Symmetry: C5
Subunit: 282 residues, 5 copies
């Protein structure tokens, strides 16, 4: 069974217009997200600076991917009638997403565990197992979706989606176990937010496999547009939504540390115009 | 009734020259606005850092859009006589504006509410209703103006302008209610400036729908030029004018907090060579 | 009377080489000027931070314009014999200058008034009158030089130069009145430097109208080269020379404020390896 | 004996896809690595700031090389059937690696010796011998692999690989001697990590010569793909793995200095959510 | 007597490969040098901040020039057989160097005088004479080498080299006199380093005129390659070697000032893992 790849469909001008929009909306939102990360980096204590580093990495790699894609889009389709017709650079409108996810899904795992209560070498061994399962999941997906079969083979897609799903269940179990172990050792206020943030990240991961099933089941400029919109939208919701959630946890944990004397922070911490902690001096 | 889209008009060299000017004037002004935002970010306390983050995002997304547009303009028209003739990349001189507004109008709502006296989860639920109504207004506009009909249909434009207008009235009501609730809980000096800043943002929003009515009613290189100039000018006035207004409120609220002992600020605050507050140490 | 526009002259290879040099020399010098602005931004107190912001804006807009121009130059002329022959993008070697001046001449006015002793219904009202007269002068010049007539009409150039000159006399009067009112309220040392800096900015503004009279009076690759060199040279002298002068005034005014207890500064201020003020703590 | 150069092989679309992936994965990972370096630069004391400077240089030069390569890849192969066929810009997909290594292998030597206990002019003379042996090793490799013979000659490759190997043994001896001399003068905790970091850097250097032996022994799109993947993977593991290891040593040495009174640090140092040292004031 | 210009010669693939390498090696090294400058800018006191500003300017202008050149190189030669054949953009592989030197040689003069013991107006008048003699030397060189005969005339080259040499002797005398006057007023340790740094800068200036004599005396792809390699190598040695030397002097002078109470520095100064001065508070 051969399917057409998502980049092998001619777009109606509406579709072509919608895909440029969402691609550029995403790059823009993630460049705002990068600026926000840099501007708010001093709200978090050095105990939790990994949260900022992961988030910065998520936003830079994603911005780059979406920039490349938007430029690839300009160069990858040619108007030949009422339709936009894909050329050889149209695969570059879809494939960079797997590059972005290959860095970013690992980095999201790291960000979540940044604000969890795992310490030392135990915190560095869960962190490796998660970065491995997460990269493997994306890379086995890229294999089905792009490499083996050319994205045109149903058996490839199903075998490499099924392998990717096993790495998903593994990463997810590793992460959920680590949050379940942390929540008792956190404060009630932090524990509630971390539980929510885990549900949000784990749920957002579900959306992505849906764009893979479309590629398996349906082809057309409709389905190419659907794919782009689903994935753009998910990237925005996850890489802007989840990354404020973890910043608020890191702020709150920093503040709790300031109140306990565990550390000092140079600025007051505000979360929603409520002061959490005062400025102090070394 | 079919209209020609704004990007489907040949430009006289005067028009072509005027459009490059205004497009480049806007990108330049917004890149200055970005530098100003970064340079003055320490004048505001951490309670009000969202104002800076929103403003930074407004300036980065807008600078990008205007850069893309200026380069699209170079590539989207070809001199064939005394006229510049639109090619397939001429829609890229008009469409990126809807991408910019899709981030920026939401971010302006956030910036205004940043310096208002709404706190906690109530401040995070007005903030979502406003970001929703604001994005929806732009996206329903992009649909009429670019996507459905190809920007060539009067019925599309009227239906999607009318939907966009409802989202406008909603966002505006949400925001005005929130400012009306805040002003009593602010100092007389801050309340006066926030009232002014609300009138300025709400009024500047009115200008934009006028460029949509032109596209409905009039076509030619005259009207394409008018559109570009109106929108460029509005972007400059709003994204440079309004964004100094909110920075002055945030400064003044920071200073009032410094005088009340609510927080400390590392530098003195000056507003117009009058000192508002002194430097202090944690 | 029709003249050839400056971008409508074929260049001898010497001229082509000289114009690339000066264009690239200017972009380079202004990128150094931008780095210097950022590196020295903490030498000035927050009372005088507008000086830094204006200067930063002058250097960013100018660097961009000169970059665009240098790339436009590479793509705007084609070697066809011993001569370089202008194409349709050769106007892009001359027109971006009016975009740069449109931001930068307003910003220079702001920078000069930054270190002057005005406030309230002038600090912000003289600043608007000056930004208006300054932008108007450039925009009326762009009209004669580029837009109306295509830069090929003597009557256009003379009418729009004459209008531009009235906006020049107005801006200049506004600025000179404001400096004359300030000098008595400054210290003898600051007053002397501000007088010098006013003479330098006002004098450098004179040079620019000379490139406009050349375009009126003379055409050839000689005169195109003369124009580029005069304007490049003026940009370097004014945007690097004047912008150190205002930084030294802001430093000295900061230091005087530190000695008077009007404010504190975190670092010592040195002007020419002579210490003006010591470091202090909030 | 003539071999085909690695850039002289037509790629199957799978191979073409795999090479874009790994090239873009590497550029992305190194741009994250650059952001991490900048964000964490204040965790290390000024005694050890060379570690940060070297690392920053490693990440910037590498990011540039991989960017250039990814763009060269887009422009250096053309789809002519089921195969991607190399042009004259395909050598630009392989040759920039030798530019990156020419800066980065010297910089890695400097980074390792940054956290070792060599001081003064003895520390500046081992540092030069290492930078020399390291640059020479890459440059003699570039000669065999690219310059002399065109990368198509076995005798060239073997003579210049053999010379490169001698510079490898020399650099390695210099570095290992310097670490062996340092470990007794370090704390047990730092000494253990530096021993590990030396083994990791020295071992990662071994991988690179394997891509050279492939070019000698095997040609095809298989072997071109193998080369890219091996080298991309090694770059990621070494330039992200090793550069966290040296940062942790610098942190720990900074902390030990803080506890001994040798210096003060403005922030607390955390290594794996365990506090090493407290914040202090001059 | 007509010579071929350096950009006229067809390159063998070895030469073409060697020139790309060295051009890219230089851009890379200077971009590392820029990052190092920014990272180490706080090691120097505000009395000596000009050293950092000059150095930053040297690294930015040079990085830009070398980037432009590397891209011009990709576009300025076309493979037509076993040879790479120059087009009209090949002069852009050689001419940007004169732009870089025009900023950078003036800036090097400023950097050397930054750490010398000249103060006030006397320091500002030697600084102008040096910036003039230095710019004039490069500009008179660009005239012989590029502009007057197209770089194809021996009489031009000899007359403009001879003029350039007089500006060299003048600048050098000005600078050496100023160092000779400073050394008695410096500490023995600083005086020794400044003497060395003067010899290093003055000696590195000698190398550059050798690439000019080659252009006069010899033409071929051999001699074009020689030119590029000599100049790249000199740029690396001078703009990375000399710029660490002046930073070490500025550090040491800062430290001496800290020990004398002349100023305070927020961080300890280390030079080669030996502490020069402690951190202090305003
Ligand atoms: C910000 C980016 C995120 C969180 C992307 C996540 C992507 C996934 C969780 C993808 C999962 C996949 C499967 C488990 C099925 C096969 C294909 C994949 C790679 C889309
Ligand atoms: C800085 C950008 C701003 C504030 C842009 C604002 C744009 C609008 C308020 C647009 C409104 C529209 C309507 C209500 C009618 C339909 C078309 C729109 C999208 C232009
Ligand atoms: C850094 C840029 C500067 C200070 C440029 C200044 C430009 C002017 C003062 C131009 C003046 C003009 C006239 C008064 C005559 C008509 C033409 C103009 C625009 C060149
Ligand atoms: C981050 C980059 C690294 C550490 C690259 C290292 C590269 C080498 C150690 C290469 C060694 C080579 C030989 C000794 C054999 C000849 C060819 C070389 C240059 C690949
Ligand atoms: C970092 C760049 C440096 C220090 C370049 C220096 C260049 C010179 C000292 C060039 C001198 C020349 C002469 C005196 C002879 C004529 C040609 C020149 C411009 C190469
Ligand atoms: C801190 C973590 C940041 C994200 C790192 C992402 C992981 C990168 C992994 C590199 C590649 C792994 C090796 C894959 C080799 C595949 C060979 C078979 C291809 C058919
Ligand atoms: C929500 C995902 C589906 C999007 C549908 C896109 C249809 C576009 C038709 C022009
Ligand atoms: C087309 C859909 C793209 C956006 C999906 C985002 C899903 C996030 C789910 C969040 C669940 C919250 C639970 C608490
Ligand atoms: C801090 C808040 C930042 C706000 C950024 C601006 C808003 C982000 C863009 C939201 C994207 C939503 C996408 C909706 C999908 C619609 C699909 C319809 C298909 C016809
Ligand atoms: C505000 C309205 C803008 C009017 C533009 C007129 C353009 C005339 C072109 C010669
Ligand atoms: C107090 C009232 C402030 C009113 C502000 C109105 C802003 C209008 C912007 C106009 C932009 C140019 C359109 C041609
Ligand atoms: C403090 C910030 C200073 C920024 C300086 C730049 C100001 C730009 C002002 C733009 C105003 C545009 C006016 C539009 C008029 C359109 C008329 C067209 C007639 C053909
Ligand atoms: C003062 C500027 C004069 C420039 C003269 C330009 C001559 C060029 C001749 C090739
Ligand atoms: C007393 C101050 C006098 C300063 C005069 C400034 C003149 C600047 C001219 C620079 C441009 C030259 C172009 C030829
Ligand atoms: C601070 C560490 C910097 C690391 C990068 C080191 C770069 C050194 C470059 C030196 C270049 C030497 C070239 C000599 C001439 C080569 C002759 C080639 C003949 C075929
Ligand atoms: C360890 C590297 C091995 C890479 C194998 C590449 C195979 C590509 C086939 C398609
Ligand atoms: C202590 C052992 C460290 C070994 C590092 C080796 C790096 C391998 C890179 C991937 C090559 C396939
Ligand atoms: C702080 C120093 C930075 C470097 C200064 C570089 C710029 C120096 C001035 C450039 C302009 C000189 C004017 C020369 C005009 C020549 C006209 C005749 C051409 C044939
Ligand atoms: C320092 C001289 C450099 C020599 C470069 C040319 C060598 C031959 C190229 C083949
Ligand atoms: C103290 C002596 C310093 C000598 C500096 C020489 C600089 C050489 C520049 C590189 C040579 C290229 C061949």
């Amino acid at each position: 069974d051969m399917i057409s790849a998502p980049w092998e469909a001619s777009l109606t001008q509406a579709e072509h217009s919608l895909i440029f929009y969402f691609l550029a909306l995403t790059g823009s939102a993630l460049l705002f997200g990068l600026a926000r990360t840099w501007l708010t980096r001093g709200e978090v204590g050095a105990r939790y600076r990994t949260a900022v580093v992961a988030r910065s990495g998520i936003m830079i790699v994603a911005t780059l991917s979406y920039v490349f894609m938007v430029l690839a889009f300009t160069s990858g389709y040619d108007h030949v009638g009422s339709l936009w017709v894909p050329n050889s650079e149209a695969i570059m409108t879809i494939a960079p997403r797997y590059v972005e996810w290959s860095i970013a899904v690992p980095l999201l795992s790291i960000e979540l565990l940044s604000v969890a209560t795992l310490s030392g070498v135990s915190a560095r061994r869960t962190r490796l197992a998660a970065v491995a399962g997460a990269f493997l999941m994306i890379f086995t997906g890229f294999l089905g979706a792009v490499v083996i079969g050319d994205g045109r083979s149903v058996g490839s897609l199903i075998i490499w989606g099924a392998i990717s799903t096993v790495f998903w269940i593994i990463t997810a179990v590793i992460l959920i176990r680590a949050i379940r172990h942390s929540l008792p050792q956190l404060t009630p206020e932090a524990a509630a937010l971390l539980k929510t943030a885990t549900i949000f990240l784990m749920s957002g991961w579900a959306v992505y496999p849906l764009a893979y099933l479309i590629q398996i089941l349906f082809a057309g400029g409709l389905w190419t547009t659907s794919i782009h919109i689903i994935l753009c939208t998910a990237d925005i919701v996850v890489k802007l939504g989840f990354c404020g959630l973890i910043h608020r946890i890191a702020k709150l944990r920093t503040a709790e540390d300031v109140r306990a004397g565990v550390d000092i922070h140079t600025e007051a911490i505000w979360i929603s115009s409520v002061k959490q902690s005062d400025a102090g001096i070394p």
